[model samples]
Target: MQTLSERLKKRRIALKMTQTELATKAGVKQQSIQLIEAGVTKRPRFLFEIAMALNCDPVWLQYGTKRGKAA
Candidate 1:
């Protein structure tokens, strides 16, 4: 995906998780997930936590790279 919003949503769905469930796993407010998925939050402060919740590397989740680049 070209954007974090698309990648995050796609991964969450592939894991069959609702937004609330993702937030719970990420230890963030549901609104935080919503904002990110909705593209309001391009890069959340809790991105690392969210990536962990989705079983994704933070780099891939943030930039859709194959972990070759550093943030």
Candidate 2:
């Protein structure tokens, strides 16, 4: 199984989004995205925002609870 950061990075690339673009869309700083992608942070809110921007389920991102449909 992929780590949270790995999953996040994969989804971000699948969406063809840059860290700056994801951050801007999520109302966060690019550095925060970088930190999270690097496994430097595990803040729930930050993860939620990143998931939201990627159109992923926050619960899935947080606890591996898969969503049957896109959010």
Candidate 3:
């Protein structure tokens, strides 16, 4: 299984968003984005915020567990 950082980095790249861009959109500091993407922090609220900013599933972002296939 991949770590949270690995998953996040993959998704971010797929979305073509830089760390600074994501941070700006999420209203968080760039360092915060760095730490989370580096798997140094696992704060649920912050994770949710980041997910909202990235338009991603928060569950997958937090737990590295994806939801079922889309209908």
The numbered model that scores best in TM-score is 1
User: lDDT per residue, candidate 2, 3-57, as tens digits?
Assistant: 6677777778888989899899988999878876788776646776778898886
Candidate 1 per-residue lDDT, tens place, 1-71, comes to 85778888889889999989989989988998889878888778998899889888776776776565568
Q: Rank by lDDT, descending?
A: 1, 3, 2
Model 1 is weakest, by summed lDDT over 10 consecutive residues, at 61-70
- Choose 1 or 3, whichever is better by TM-score: 1
Tens-place lDDT per residue, model 3, 1-71, is 24667777778888989988888888888898888777787664577777878877666766678778776
Stretches of candidate 1 exceeding 4 Å from the true structure: 68-71
- The C-alpha lDDT values of all candidates are 0.84, 0.75, 0.76
Candidate ordering by TM-score (highest first): 1, 3, 2
Task: Please give the lDDT score at residue 68 for candidate 3.
Answer: 80
TM-score of each: 0.86, 0.76, 0.77
Per-residue error for 37 in candidate 3, Å, reads 1.5
